[PDB]
Scaffold this active site. Structure first.
Site, PDB file in Angstrom:
ATOM      1  N   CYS A 272       0.746  -1.255   0.000  1.00 30.22           N
ATOM      2  CA  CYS A 272       0.000   0.000   0.000  1.00 30.22           C
ATOM      3  C   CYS A 272       0.787   1.325   0.000  1.00 30.22           C
ATOM      4  O   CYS A 272       0.517   2.198  -0.824  1.00 30.22           O
ATOM      5  CB  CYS A 272      -1.066  -0.005   1.117  1.00 30.22           C
ATOM      6  N   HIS A 330      -3.441   1.202   6.459  1.00 25.12           N
ATOM      7  CA  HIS A 330      -3.515   1.177   5.015  1.00 25.12           C
ATOM      8  C   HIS A 330      -3.224   2.589   4.546  1.00 25.12           C
ATOM      9  O   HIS A 330      -3.711   3.559   5.114  1.00 25.12           O
ATOM     10  CB  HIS A 330      -4.888   0.718   4.529  1.00 25.12           C
ATOM     11  N   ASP A 353      -6.949   5.503  -4.433  1.00 26.96           N
ATOM     12  CA  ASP A 353      -6.264   4.343  -3.854  1.00 26.96           C
ATOM     13  C   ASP A 353      -5.798   3.372  -4.924  1.00 26.96           C
ATOM     14  O   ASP A 353      -6.624   2.723  -5.565  1.00 26.96           O
ATOM     15  CB  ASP A 353      -7.226   3.606  -2.923  1.00 26.96           C
TER      16      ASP A 353
END
Ligand SMILES: [Br-]
Ligand SMILES: [Br-]
Ligand SMILES: [Br-]
Ligand SMILES: [Ca+2]
Ligand SMILES: [Ca+2]
Ligand SMILES: [Ca+2]
Ligand SMILES: [Cl-]
Ligand SMILES: [Cl-]
Ligand SMILES: [Cl-]
Ligand SMILES: [Cl-]
EC number: 2.3.2.13
Length: 673
Positions: A272, A330, A353
Site C-alpha cells: 500500500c 492502510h 487508492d
C-alpha cells in the site's frame, strides 16, 4: 518572397519559471494550461496587412478540434477565450507573440505548427513541442489551490513522510517522490498512454485528460500491475523471492524507471505505501495537488455491509477464515480538485487508492471519492464510496469458530476501533497531521452512529483482560508481555486461558506460530491476576518478517460464560541505523557522509547492501555491497553525494542483511547557495 519562419525562441527559462515548472530536470518546454507564455518568432521578412498566421497545436493520436485535442488559432491583436495567439510587439522580422491555452485543455504532450497565408498561397511548418500540465495556480482550473504554503507542499515538494505502524504505536518512513528527477515526468505522462482506457479508445481517452477525476482514476488503476501491465506487483505473503521486499524501497524514482526500463513489466514487489508513493508522484508531477494518507485499523469490507469479520478458535489462534480483513494500517492518496459531477459541496480533497484491494467496474481502480462525501455517509456517489467508507468506519465483529464442530459464534462488536489516527504529513514540516475529523464525525457521538446507519441504508463476561508490553521490543531481544486479568463478578470463578503468538504481515496475513501456552486458574471476586508471556529471539526470529510484528492472542473462557478475547499486535524495532554528514553541505559541492550500523546479534550479519537516495542530493539510488559484520561489531560505510539544488533535502537509506531485512534511516540535510 513568400513569408516563412526563420527561427523560433521558446524562451523556455522565462516561461517555465513563470509557469512554476522550472524544477523539472527535462529540457523540454513544460507549461500549465490556462496560462500565457511568450515566444519570439523571427520571420524571413516583415508582416503584411494581407498575410495571416494560423497557429496549430494538437495532442494524442487523433487531434480532434471538437474534442479539444486539437486547436487552430489566428495571430490577433486582441485575445480570444481558449487557445489564442496575440501579436504583442513587432520589431525587425522578429514577432513577439503571447500564446494562451484554455483552463480546460487536456494535459499531456503537444505539437505546435504554423500555417502561413502569404502571396496567394498557404504553407505549413512544424514549430516544436511542449508538455502541458494542470495548473493549481490558476483560479479557474479544476485543481486550483489558493494557499501558497499548501500548494508548495502538495505540488512542489518532492520529499515526503508516510506514517506507519499500529494504533498502539505510530511510526514513519521517509519516501522520495522525486517528481522532478529525470524521465519521471515523461514516464508518468507515458502511463496515460498505456492505460486500458487509452487502448480501448485512444481518441476519447486523450480527450478526457482535461479532467483530474479521469486522470486520477486512470492512475489509481495504472500504478498497480493488475489488469493492465501496470507498474507495481503487490505481494503480502511475507516472502518476496524474485523481487524486492516491499519495505526496502525508499522512493518512486527507481520504481517508475525500472518499470519503463523492463519494457513496462511488473515491478516486484510493492505494498500500500509503495503504491501510494508512486501514485502520489504521478499526481504531483502532472500538476494535481496531492498528499498521502494513512488510516490505522483499515477495514476491507467485501460484502458491502459496513461490517468486517475477524475469527479466532478456542485455543486462542488468529484465523484467516473471512474474506474481509482488518489491516493495522492502510495507505492511499487524496487528490485536490472540484467535483463538477457531484456538486459544489463535494469539491476539495478526493480519495485515490492504487492498492489492488477491490475491483471497481471489474478492474482494480479506486477513486475519486470526495472525503466530504465520506463523512456524511453519502455512499451513493462515485466512486467506490461504500468500500472507502468501510475502510474508515465499518463495524468489527469478532467471531469464535471451532473447526472440529463447524460451529461459529459471535463474540463481540466494535463500532469505534476501525478508522483511527488517520494521518498525513504536515505542511512544511514532518509533524503528523491527524485528519480523522475529516473522514468522520467523532467515534462515540450520535452523529457517527447516525451517519453509519444512513450509509448502511443506502446499501440496503466475568473476566476482563489486557495485554501489557514489558520493556522495549526490538529484533534480537526477547519479547516480554503480561496478560492482566481481573474478576469483576461477585463470584469466584475458574478461568482457562489459551494464548498464542503469530508473526504477521501488517495487513493481517498470519504467517506462523512462534509461541503458545495454557493456564487454568481460580480468581476471587475482584481479584486481579497477571500471567507472564515470554518469547525468545530464537523462537520468533525464525518466522519474523520484515514487518517485525507479532499477533498476541489470549482467549479466556469461564464455565458457562461466553469467551473473552484479549488481543494485541506488537511492533519490534530494528537495531538503529544512522546517517551523518561529515561537513557543511553546499550546492554543486561534494558532501561526505557515512552509514553506521551495530549488529546486536550473537551471530554475524551477511549479504549486507546499502541503498541511498534523495532528490537534489544524489542522482538515483546509490547501491553499496557491505562486508559481512561480526556479532557486536560496527559497520561504517563512507560515501559522497553532490547537492544539485539548495534547501532542506532528504537523505534516505536502506540497510539489508540476512538477519535484518529493510532497516531504514533518514537524515534531513540543509543545502546552501
Ligand atoms: Br462544482
Ligand atoms: Br502496553
Ligand atoms: Br507495540
Ligand atoms: Ca492495474
Ligand atoms: Ca462484511
Ligand atoms: Ca465507527
Ligand atoms: Cl499565476
Ligand atoms: Cl522527463
Ligand atoms: Cl486537511
Ligand atoms: Cl526528512
Amino acid at each position: 518572397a513568400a513569408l516563412g519562419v526563420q527561427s523560433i525562441n521558446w524562451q523556455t527559462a522565462f516561461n517555465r519559471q513563470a509557469h512554476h515548472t522550472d524544477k523539472f530536470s527535462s529540457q523540454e518546454l513544460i507549461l500549465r494550461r490556462g496560462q500565457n507564455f511568450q515566444v519570439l518568432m523571427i520571420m524571413n521578412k516583415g508582416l503584411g496587412s494581407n498575410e495571416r498566421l494560423e497557429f496549430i497545436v494538437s495532442t494524442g493520436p487523433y487531434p480532434s478540434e471538437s474534442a479539444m485535442t486539437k486547436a487552430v488559432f489566428p495571430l490577433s491583436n486582441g485575445s480570444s477565450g481558449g487557445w489564442s495567439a496575440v501579436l504583442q510587439a513587432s520589431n525587425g522580422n522578429t514577432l513577439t507573440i503571447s500564446i494562451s491555452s484554455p483552463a480546460s485543455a487536456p494535459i499531456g504532450r503537444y505539437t505546435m505548427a504554423l500555417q502561413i497565408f502569404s502571396q496567394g498561397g498557404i504553407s505549413s511548418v512544424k514549430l516544436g513541442t511542449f508538455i502541458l500540465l494542470f495548473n493549481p495556480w490558476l483560479n479557474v482550473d479544476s485543481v486550483f489551490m489558493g494557499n501558497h504554503a499548501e500548494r508548495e507542499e502538495y505540488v512542489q515538494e518532492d520529499a515526503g513522510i508516510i506514517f506507519v505502524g499500529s494504533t498502539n504505536r505510530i511510526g514513519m518512513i521517509g519516501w522520495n517522490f522525486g517528481q522532478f528527477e529525470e524521465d519521471i515526468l515523461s514516464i508518468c505522462l507515458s502511463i496515460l498512454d498505456r492505460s486500458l482506457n487509452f487502448r480501448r479508445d485512444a481518441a476519447t481517452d486523450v480527450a478526457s485528460r482535461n479532467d483530474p477525476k479521469y486522470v486520477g482514476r486512470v492512475l489509481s488503476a495504472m500504478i498497480n500491475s493488475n489488469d493492465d501491465n501496470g507498474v507495481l506487483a503487490g505481494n503480502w505473503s511475507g516472502t518476496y523471492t524474485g523481487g524486492r521486499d516491499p519495505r526496502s524501497w525508499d522512493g518512486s524514482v527507481e520504481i517508475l524507471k525500472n518499470w519503463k526500463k523492463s519494457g513496462l513489466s511488473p515491478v516486484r514487489y510493492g505494498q500500500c505505501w509503495v503504491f501510494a508513493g508512486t501514485l502520489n508522484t504521478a499526481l504531483r508531477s502532472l500538476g494535481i495537488p496531492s498528499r498521502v494518507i494513512t488510516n490505522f485499523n483499515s477495514a476491507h469490507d467485501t460484502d458491502r455491509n459496513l461490517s468486517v469479520d475477524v475469527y479466532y478458535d478456542p485455543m486462542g489462534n488468529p484465523l484467516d477464515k473471512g474474506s474481509d480483513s482488518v489491516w493495522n494500517f492502510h495507505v492511499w492518496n487524496e487528490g485536490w480538485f472540484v467535483r463538477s459531477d457531484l456538486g459544489p459541496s463535494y469539491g476539495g480533497w478526493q480519495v485515490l487508492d492504487a492498492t489492488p484491494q477491490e475491483r471497481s467496474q471489474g478492474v482494480f481502480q479506486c477513486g475519486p471519492a470526495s472525503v466530504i462525501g465520506v463523512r456524511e455517509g453519502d455512499v451513493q456517489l462515485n466512486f467506490d464510496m461504500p468500500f472507502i467508507f468501510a475502510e474508515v468506519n465499518a463495524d468489527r465483529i469478532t467471531w469464535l469458530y471451532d473447526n472440529t464442530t463447524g460451529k461459529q459464534w459471535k463474540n463481540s462488536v466494535n463500532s469505534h476501533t476501525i478508522g483511527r489516527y488517520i494521518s498525513t504529513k504536515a505542511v512544511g514540516s514532518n509533524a503528523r497531521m491527524d485528519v480523522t475529523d475529516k473522514y468522520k464525525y467523532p467515534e462515540g457521538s450520535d452523529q457517527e452512529r447516525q451517519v453509519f446507519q444512513k450509509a448502511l441504508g443506502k446499501l440496503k463476561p466475568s473476566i476482563i483482560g489486557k495485554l501489557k508490553v514489558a520493556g522495549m521490543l526490538a529484533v534480537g531481544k526477547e519479547v516480554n508481555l503480561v496478560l492482566l486479568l481481573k474478576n469483576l463478578s461477585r463470584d469466584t470463578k475458574t478461568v482457562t486461558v489459551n494464548m498464542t503468538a503469530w508473526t504477521i504481515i501488517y495487513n493481517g496475513t498470519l504467517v506462523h506460530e512462534v509461541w503458545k501456552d495454557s493456564a487454568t486458574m481460580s480468581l476471587d471476586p475482584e481479584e486481579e491476576a497477571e500471567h507472564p508471556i515470554k518469547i525468545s529471539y530464537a523462537q520468533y526470529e525464525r518466522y519474523l518478517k520484515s514487518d517485525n510484528m507479532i499477533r498476541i492472542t489470549a482467549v479466556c473462557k469461564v464455565p458457562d460464560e461466553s469467551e473473552v478475547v484479549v488481543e494485541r499486535d506488537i511492533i519490534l524495532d530494528n537495531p538503529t541505523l544512522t546517517l551523518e554528514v561529515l561537513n557543511e553541505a553546499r550546492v554543486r559541492k561534494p558532501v561526505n557522509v557515512q552509514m553506521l550500523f551495530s549488529n546486536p546479534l550473537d551471530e554475524p550479519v551477511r549479504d549486507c547492501v546499502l541503498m541511498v537516495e534523495g532528490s537534489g542530493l544524489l542522482l538515483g539510488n546509490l547501491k553499496i555491497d557491505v562486508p559481512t559484520l561480526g556479532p557486536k561489531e560496527r559497520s561504517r560505510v563512507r560515501f559522497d553525494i553532490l547537492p544539485s539544488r539548495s534547501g532542506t533535502k532528504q537523505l534516505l537509506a536502506d540497510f539489508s542483511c540476512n538477519k535484518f531485512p529493510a532497516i531504514k534511516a533518514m537524515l534531513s540535510i540543509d543545502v546552501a547557495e
